[model samples]
Target: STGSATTTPIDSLDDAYITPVQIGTPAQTLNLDFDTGSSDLWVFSSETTASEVDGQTIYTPSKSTTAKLLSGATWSISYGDGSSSSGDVYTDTVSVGGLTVTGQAVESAKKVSSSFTEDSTIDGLLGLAFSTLNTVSPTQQKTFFDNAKASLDSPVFTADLGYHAPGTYNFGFIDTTAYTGSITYTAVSTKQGFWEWTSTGYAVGSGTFKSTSIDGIADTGTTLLYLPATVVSAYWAQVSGAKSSSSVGGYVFPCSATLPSFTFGVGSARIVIPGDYIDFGPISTGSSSCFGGIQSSAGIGINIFGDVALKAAFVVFNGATTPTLGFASK
Candidate 1:
C-alpha cells in the first residue's frame, strides 16, 4: 500500500513544528508537521507552558509584529505513528514571501506526548498535500494551500526538496519533462493529499512480474521504503548480495556497498529507485540483509516509501483538477 506519508518512526519522535510562515522577516518561523495520513495545520500559543516547549520554537506575537491569534481556533493532531498532540487553536497573520495570509491557523499544543515529543529534530510539519487529508475539517478546516493559494497566479503549489535531500525526497513545481510524458493518476479517495494507489503488482528486473503483491499507500513523509515479501525478495534475487543485516533496516545500507537499481511499478508509472539510495552501508551483520531500496513493512498495508523514493521526481496531488495523480521532474 503506497499512500501519502512522512517518517517519524512512530518510535523516533521529534519536535512538533509547522512550516515557516516567514523565515527572517517575522523571525517567527512557523512550525509544521506535513502529513498524508491526515489533513491538518496549527501552531503554538501563549497558554502553552512546558519547559521543553521553551527550548523549542515558541511563537510570540512580540517576536513577529504581524502575528495574530484567533479567539478560539483550537486544534490538535494524532498521527498514524501512534503519536498525538492537541491544544488551543488560534489564528495569525501568517506572512510567506511577499504574500500575507491573514487568519492562518495555529495549534498551541499543550498536550503532545508519545515518541514524537522526545526528539528535537522534528520541529514541525509542512503537510503540503491535499485538502481532504488536511486536519482542517469542517469544524476547523484551514489548509496551507487554501490560505496561500491567493498568493500564486496559477493557484498551484510545488515543493523542491532536492536542494534539501537530493534523490531522497523533493516536492514542488511539476516539471512535465520528468515523466515519460504520460501520467497514470489515481483518484484521491480521501480529502487529504495522500496519493491513493492500486498496484497490479511490482517488477524489478523486467516484465509483468506477479511477485507477492501489496496494496496500500506511500509517503514522502517517511524515510524508509517498504515492500511485501514477494516483491522485496524477488528484488534481492537479481542484486549481487544483501547489503546489510536486518538490524540496520530501511533503504539505508552500510554506505560501502553498491547495489542494483529498483524499478517500482505504481499504477501506470514504472518508477526506478537507484541502488545508491538503498545501499546506505555495507553488511556489517551477517548474510546480505542489506538495506537497499527495499525493506520489510511496518505492517501489512502500511508500507510507506519515504524520501528514499521521493526525490526521483516531482509529484502532484491534482485532486482539485483531476482524478489522475501527476509525477513529473524537478
Candidate 2:
C-alpha cells in the first residue's frame, strides 16, 4: 500500500538523503542519493576503473542474471557542484523500500569526477526529477518513482528532512504524525524538469516581510539555499563578522555571529528557518569561521530551495496531478 524509509544525515552537509535500492535478480543493495533536482539513476559499477573507484560500493551487472544491456545506450550527468558521472546502460530489476519495478534502466558508471570519487559514502544517485530530464541515449528512461506510480496507493511522496537528525521519506503516503498544522499547498511549474514554485517573499530577523515574488526550486540534492545576491547580502549584513570569502567559498561569518531566523512565504503560509541551522559546517578544522547555508545563485541564474530550506518544513511532492507541493511545519 505504502512504503517508507529513514533518511540519515550525511555529516550534516545537509546535502542529501540516502535510500537503499536493490537492483538485479540477487538484489545488489546500493545506498543512493535520492535527488529531486535531476533525473537519472546511476551507480558506481563493475565497469568503473579501479583508480576511479574509492570507498564506494559498486553494482555488478555480471552477477545479476536479470541484467540486460541497453545496447548502444549511454548516459552522462553533471551537477551544479561540479560532480559528474557517465556510463553505459542496463535494464534490470530495481526495488526501493517495498516497491519494485522490472526493466528499469540503470546507468552503470564507467567514469566519475573527483567530486564523486572523493565522496566515498554515496554509491550513486536516484533522480526524482521529471522523467523528461533523464540523460539517456535513444530513449529517455522513466525514474523508479514514475514506473512504480501506477501501483502506488496514492501518487505522492513526502520529504521529512531534519536538522542534524534522522528524517523519513514516505512514498504513496502521508504520515500526519510527522508534521503539525495543516499542509499549505503551492503549485509547481515543471517546465524546467524541476519542482519549481514561487514564494510570496521572505524576511530576515524580526523585520517586515518583503513582498517580492521569489521563484526557485525545491532541490533535495543541493546542500544549501541559493538566492539572489541582493537577498544574500541583506541577510548577511545583519551578522557583525560576515564577509565574502573566496578561500572558504561563498560568504563566511564568525561561528558565533548572531543570525536571525529566515522566513519564506508560500501563499499565506510563513515557513521560518531557524537561525541556528543557517550556520553550516565550519570552514576549516578548529576554525571559528563558518559558511552561511544561504548563498547567492549569481551565475547559476536561478534560485534554489536546497536542504537548508527544505529541512525546516514537511514537504509533499504531489505527483498525482500537475505535481503540486504542500508545505507544513515539522
Candidate 3:
C-alpha cells in the first residue's frame, strides 16, 4: 500500500518537523517528530510521571482495546543533544497517513528529559532509520517503517522537508510533482543504522566545487547542517563580520550580513541551499547577531546533513534489498 503525510515545521527557524500519527482501537492522534536518525518509536504517555508531563499530549494505551503490553520489554534512547527518554513497550494498531500497521511496537514513555517535556509542539518521535538501531532490550522491535515495508508498493520513503513551511513524507511511492529534475542515486551504508552516504564535494556560493569525499548521514532529527571545520571556515570567511565566538558557541555574524548560498554534490548532481536558509535568525530576541545554520562537525564525530541541508533538496530513503539514497532538486 502507500501513504502520504504532511510534516509541518515546529517554529519559524524550522528547528524540527512534526507529523500526525494515529494509534490504538479508537484513533488517538498525536503529533510526532518523524526522525530519520533514530530507530525507536517512542511517545509521551499516561505512564509518564506527572511532574514530567508538560503541555504535550499523552498517548494512553489503556484507552485502546487493541493495546497489548509487551511484558519485560523496555526501551531508552539518548540523543546527541543530551535529551533522552525511556519507557515500557506496547503493541497496538498504529496508522500514519492512511497506512495501517497492526501490532506495531509503541514505546510509552515513563521518563523524559526536561528538553522534551518543555517542547510542547511534539508528543513523540517516529524513527525511520534502520530497525537495527532499535534500543528495546530483551526483544528488540522493528521500526514502523521496517514493519510496513513489505506492504509498501516499493520499499521506499521520501522526505520533502521545507524551510519555514510545511512539507511532505511519502511512503511506497515518490510524488513526481514534488521535485524538479531527475534524481541522483547513491550507495547507502546501513552498517551504522543510519542513512549514511558519501558526498562528492561542496562549494561556497558560486565558488569552484572541491572534489573530495565526505561521509555523513542524512538526519532529519538534527536542526542544523554540520560539515568539516575546513569547509565551514571557508564558507564563513566569505562573509564579513562573521566569526567563531566561544561565548556564542558557534559561528555568528551580523544579522544583516549578506550570506552566501552553499552547494553540495550528490554524485554528479549539485544541490544548492539558499543564503537566507543559512542565516538562522538572531541569537537573541532583539540581538543583531545571528547564528549560522551551517556549523563545524569536527567535535560531532561525524558530519550530519540535517534539516538545513535536507530542506534544500528532495531526499529518498530507499529500503530495497540493496538500499540506496536518492537526491533531487525541488
Candidate 4:
C-alpha cells in the first residue's frame, strides 16, 4: 500500500509543518506534526485537562468504537526545547493519506507543557523515527511507519519540506517528479534512535567546499541548522554586521546585511540553502537585528540538520533491514 499527505507550514517563519491524520473508528482528523526526530504518536485528547487545552483539536477515543485501551501502557516524551507531554495509550485504526494501519498505538495526552498549549497550530505529534525510540513503558509501541511498513510497496518514506509553502510526505514509494537529478544515499546509524548520518563538508556562500566530516541528525522537529562553532563562526564572519549576542541568545545581524548561502554535502552531492533561509527573521517584532537560521552546536552535543537544512533538499527515510538516508535536489 502507498500513502501521500500534504504538510503545511504552521506559521510565517515555517516554525513547523503539520499534516492531517485520521484516528479512531469515525476518523477524528487532527493536524499533527510528522516529526522524524522522535518516536511517540501522541495527541491532545479528552483525557487532557481542560485548563491545558487551548484552541487545539482533541482526540476522543471514547467516540471511536474501534478504540481499545492498552492496559498498563503509558508514554511520556520530552524535546530538546524542554517541551514535554505524557499520557495513556490506546489502539485504534489510524489512516494517513489513503493507507490504513489497524491497531495503531495512539497516545492520548493527559498532561502537556505550557509551550504545547500555546502552539495551537498542531494538535499533536506523529513520530516517524524508529520504534526503538518509543517512550511507552513496559512494552514499547511501534510507530505508524513501522506498523505499516510490511503493507507498503517499499519500507520507506520521503519528506519534501518546502520553504513557507506546502510540502509532501510520501509513504511506500518515491515520487520521482518531486526532485531533480539523482539521489545520493548514505548509511544511517539508528544507535541513538535518530536518522543520524555524517555530512561530507560545507561551504560558506560562494567559497570553496570544506572537506570535513560533520556528524548530525536529520531532524524535522527542530527549526534551525546547528553546526560546530568553527563552521558557524566562519559563515557569520562573512556577514558585515553579524555577531553572537547574549541578548538574542545566538548570532544576530543587521536586517539588511547581505547573507551568503550555505552549502552542505551529502556524499558527493551538494545542497545549497538560499541566503534568505539563513536570514531567519528579525529577533523581535520590527527589530533591526535578525536571528540567523544557522547556529553553533557547542552545547547541543551534536549538530542538527533541521528544517533550515532539510528544506533545501528532498529527504528519504529508508526503513530497510539496514536503514539508509537519501537526499536529492529539487
Error of 2 at 59 (Å): 0.6
- Number of clashes recorded per candidate: 74, 0, 0, 0
Candidate 2 structure quality by residue, lDDT tens digits, 1-330? 577878777676665667788999899999988898999999999999789999999999999999999999999888877789999999999987777889999999999999888888789999998999999988889997898788888998889887988788888888999999889999999999999999999999898999888999999999889998989999999899899988777999998777889999999998999998898867878889988999999999899999999999999999976899999997
For residues 1-330, write the lDDT of model 4, one tens digit per residue. Answer: 999999999999899999999998799999999999999999999999889999999999999999999999999998988999999999999999999999999999999999999999899999998899999998999999999999999999999999989999999999999999999999999999999999999999999999999999999999899999999999999999899998779999999987999999999999999998887788989999999999999998889999999999999999999999999999
The TM-score measured for candidate 4 stands at 0.99
Candidate structures ordered by TM-score, highest first: 3, 4, 2, 1
Give the per-residue lDDT of model 3 (tens digit) for 1-330: 999999999998898999999999899999999999999999999999989989888999999999999999999999988999999999999999999999999999999999999999999999999999999998999999999999999999999999889999999998899999999999999999999999999999999999899999999999999999999999999999999999998999999899999999999999999999998889999999999999999888999999999999999999999999999999
Model 4 CA lDDT for position 327: 97
What lDDT score is found at residue 272 in candidate 1?
64
Q: In order, what is each prediction's RMSD in angstroms?
A: 6.3, 1.2, 0.7, 0.7
Clashing pairs in 3: none
User: Candidate 4 regions off by >4 Å?
Assistant: none
Per-prediction TM-score, please? 0.71, 0.97, 0.99, 0.99
Q: Which of candidates 1 and 3 is the stronger one according to lDDT? A: 3
Better of 1 and 2 by lDDT: 2
Among all windows of 10 consecutive residues in model 3, the one with the lowest summed lDDT is: 49-58
